[PDB]
Symmetry: none
Subunit: 271 residues, 2 copies
Amino acid sequence: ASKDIITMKGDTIRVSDLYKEAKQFPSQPTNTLLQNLTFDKIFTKDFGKEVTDKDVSKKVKSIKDQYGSQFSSALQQQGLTEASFTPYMRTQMLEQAAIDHEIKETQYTDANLKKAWESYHPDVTAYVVSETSKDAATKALDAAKKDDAGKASFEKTNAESKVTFNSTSTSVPTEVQTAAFKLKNGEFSDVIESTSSSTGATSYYIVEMVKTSEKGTDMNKYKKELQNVIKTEKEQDTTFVSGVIAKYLKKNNVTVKESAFASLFSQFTQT
Amino acid sequence: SKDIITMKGDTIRVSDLYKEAKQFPSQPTNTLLQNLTFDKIFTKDFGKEVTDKDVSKKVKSIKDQYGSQFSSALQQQGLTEASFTPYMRTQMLEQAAIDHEIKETQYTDANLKKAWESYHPDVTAYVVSETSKDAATKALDAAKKDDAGKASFEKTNAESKVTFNSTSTSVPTEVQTAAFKLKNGEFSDVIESTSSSTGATSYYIVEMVKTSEKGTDMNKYKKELQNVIKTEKEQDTTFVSGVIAKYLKKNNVTVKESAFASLFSQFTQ
């Protein structure tokens, strides 16, 4: 007795196809095995020639080399083996090829460019110094604004804190950025207070502008920069990715024949 | 069309796995195989003792007690009302094997004596709990004052008159110890009991109505002591894991698909 579980254009997932995934990921549930096996097929039909076995094994090695000794425990946290990581990375790379392509061909619309432009600020170079105690930051600032001598001490002492950031920075906090975009070259800021949402600590920043900047009135001057702002946001927007999946599902007429898994792609057929 | 797991007179094939996959799409392949194996090995020896009617009957009696909470009670466990019946079936088949192993090997004289050293039979008495010590002190003085205050205590705390033994979970040890020293009609002092779980301190008052003694014959309370050994062994994870390991080894359970090789490593070591 032979029976199809999922139907799509030019292909179909059978029980044998499921059991093959079950043997490769005994820890993963049936639902996941089906979802991943479906994505693998629909994304291989349009981006397979762009993600060869060499492209996969090459990226896997570059990642293994960065994690180093932690790579083993990094795969356990995900519930994978070094052997099952290659095929897992293959499906993740095929799925990523589809989202990257969709972002590039449809998200850089005038409406999104203007949305990003409303709060955008170009690169500025300046000394951004963090302190734990408020009293410490207050004395360090008074010593820097005292005279040109104390200013050189601040610049020599906090030499590694001289950075280049824009409105998309993750290292420089929003309170600091706002106070910094108001400074003139050579000007110092007040003791900026910033409470971290991740940890929960309260740091005290001091900023000295070196090279400031203005976006101006022409948005087209920073069109490439704004496209990269839209790119980094869409990649992190779970709603957008689920939408990309829903598209390729609808495109290949993916249908669940086994009523037992009816709500298999319910997480995507809502976006 | 290939065999995944082999055992005596039977085998788990891919079709058998896909049938479980459709019943528990959220559970992983490993779990589907383990449960499907236990279901088969325990059904081979205790299936006639736990029929589908025995399962659906107990399931209904539980659904009726939880009432409206039953839905949210199954979510906390990660189950549906439909997947609860077959889950209860495997739990009952596995329990039939543990109960049978306990009955045929754990009611040894050595274990009966171990249970008997701290056993005490049923006693009927008024057990009243209080939050503040001063409240319990006044309630007691009012009861031991005269026969009038004694009737007030018995009328007001009428539903506190209970029957407990040394295996009670509701009456704390400090209270039990002070109660087994009372004679019929006698009141206890304000008993202080500190909970090991929370950390709160209650103040109990006990009035004996019908006391009892275990005596010198342990055989008189044989059934009670067997139930003491039974409730302990069911909760000894080492013993239960041993029971599983036995039925696995007994049916020569073997994983043929090397992909699941270490499937029962957690049970057979």
